[PDB]
């Protein structure tokens, strides 16, 4: 029927003045574009078919050709930037926004999908979709008393497209667009579908990846407890964006960070800092490093929750990039912590895994670790216990590492190494 048409035949049918001939040719184009291996997107673009597809979007009296061209344009728009641009250049954005109000659910869903692809290209096309007025019709489709009455696949497509309207950072989405979208996002964050939840958290993670004012717009909508709950989900596609969102929020103020602590997030971190997926461990340790960069009462909550032994853990054994986040977590801890808090670090065994990491060739992690050691020695000076710590560093081979680092190509590796030796290893 419409399987395995040549492009030349598709053009012949679309160029006839017979709507039914154009419908069959358009469906055949859709089927070509739907195959997984190397769909002839450029061949379809080169044949001048995009203006015709866009024109078919407006044929209200023939909804099948609206659907077939919507699907075809969706798949062209799903390619490279140049391929998405060709769809935009053909006038597709307002035609797709007009289809959002279609009485045919499968047609409006396809328009939702298509706009998601166009917005997904980047901030310029994202903001152009916003300027054409897409947000109001999109949100109207979710203005129902109970989300559960909407078709699952429909709801997932709306959520995903909304997440693209929140994505990308230079520039971030318009402030008023984010405010318009947020209450619907909050509602989707409480839905029970795992895919809606994953994409909802992805959207929140994009919105919190910016300055503190962007974080605050999200935080004051009250989503932090729900994010913490999703942090404990069994589905890793939910935990990853939830954790990215939580970690983003703790890059903000101590007040915004405190709301993460208040919501009970630290109790999840024994699992996160031992999580088998290496990227979860990295994100969780980075998150921890920004919490230990906070106030002393926030460092105390890390201590209370038993998380210092888990930092000793990842410092002792983890992927290197996670180990460097753990080094940062320690140095931040030692910069803001009390004497008692810093002494507790030593009691948990931080010193030897810290010393072993001075074997690394990463120059910045060596600077990080030497800053931590200096801060710990400063805590030892206020107690008259500098030498008990020097023998501890010497007994685990740490002194041999600090002494060797005086011959390092960076000129503050040495200049911190020799000062440590000059002052504490006389």
């Amino acid at each position: 029927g419409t399987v395995n048409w040549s492009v030349e035949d598709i053009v012949k049918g679309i160029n006839s003045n017979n709507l039914e001939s154009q419908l069959q040719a358009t469906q055949a184009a859709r089927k070509l574009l739907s195959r997984e291996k190397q769909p002839p997107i450029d061949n379809i673009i080169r044949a001048g078919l995009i203006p015709k597809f866009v024109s078919f979007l407006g044929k209200t009296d023939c909804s099948p050709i609206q659907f077939e061209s919507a699907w075809a344009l969706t798949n062209i728009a799903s390619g490279t930037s140049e391929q998405t641009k060709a769809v935009v250049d053909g006038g597709a954005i307002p035609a797709f926004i007009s289809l959002l109000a279609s009485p045919h659910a499968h047609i409006s869903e396809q328009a939702v999908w298509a706009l998601g692809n166009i917005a997904g290209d980047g901030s310029a096309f994202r903001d152009l979709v916003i300027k054409h007025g897409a947000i109001d019709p999109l949100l109207a489709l979710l203005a129902v008393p109970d989300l559960s009455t909407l078709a699952c696949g429909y709801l997932r497509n709306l959520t995903w497209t909304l997440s693209n309207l929140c994505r990308n950072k230079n520039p971030a989405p318009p402030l008023d667009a984010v405010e318009q979208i947020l209450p619907t996002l909050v509602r989707l964050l409480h839905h029970n579908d795992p895919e809606v939840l994953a994409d909802s958290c992805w959207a929140i993670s994009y919105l919190t990846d910016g300055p503190n004012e962007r974080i605050e717009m999200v935080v004051k909508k009250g989503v932090v407890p729900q994010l913490v709950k999703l942090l404990g989900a069994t589905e890793l596609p939910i935990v990853t964006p939830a954790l990215r969102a939580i970690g983003n929020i703790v890059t903000g103020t101590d007040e915004q960070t405190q709301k993460v602590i208040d919501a009970g997030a630290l109790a999840v971190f024994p699992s996160l800092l031992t999580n088998p997926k290496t990227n979860i461990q990295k994100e969780a340790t980075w998150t921890m490093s920004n919490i230990t960069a906070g106030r002393q009462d926030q460092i105390q909550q890390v201590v209370n929750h038993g998380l210092v032994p888990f930092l000793v853990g990842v410092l002792s054994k983890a992927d290197f990039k996670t180990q460097k986040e753990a080094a940062w977590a320690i140095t931040n801890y030692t910069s803001g912590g009390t004497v008692e808090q810093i002494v507790y670090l030593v009691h948990c065994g931080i010193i030897e895994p810290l010393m072993n990491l001075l074997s690394a060739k990463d120059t910045k992690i060596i600077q990080v670790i030497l800053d931590a050691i200096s801060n710990i020695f400063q805590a030892a000076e206020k107690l008259g216990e500098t030498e008990k710590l020097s023998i501890m560093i010497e007994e685990c081979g740490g002194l041999d590492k600090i002494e060797a680092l005086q011959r390092h190509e960076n000129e503050s590796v040495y200049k911190a190494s020799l000062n440590l030796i000059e002052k504490y290893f006389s």
Binding site: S34, E36, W71, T74, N75, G79, G116, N117, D199, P237
Partner: peptide
Amino acid sequence: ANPRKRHRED
């Protein structure tokens, strides 16, 4: 996991 664009095979 979070692709910017999605192709429709259906």
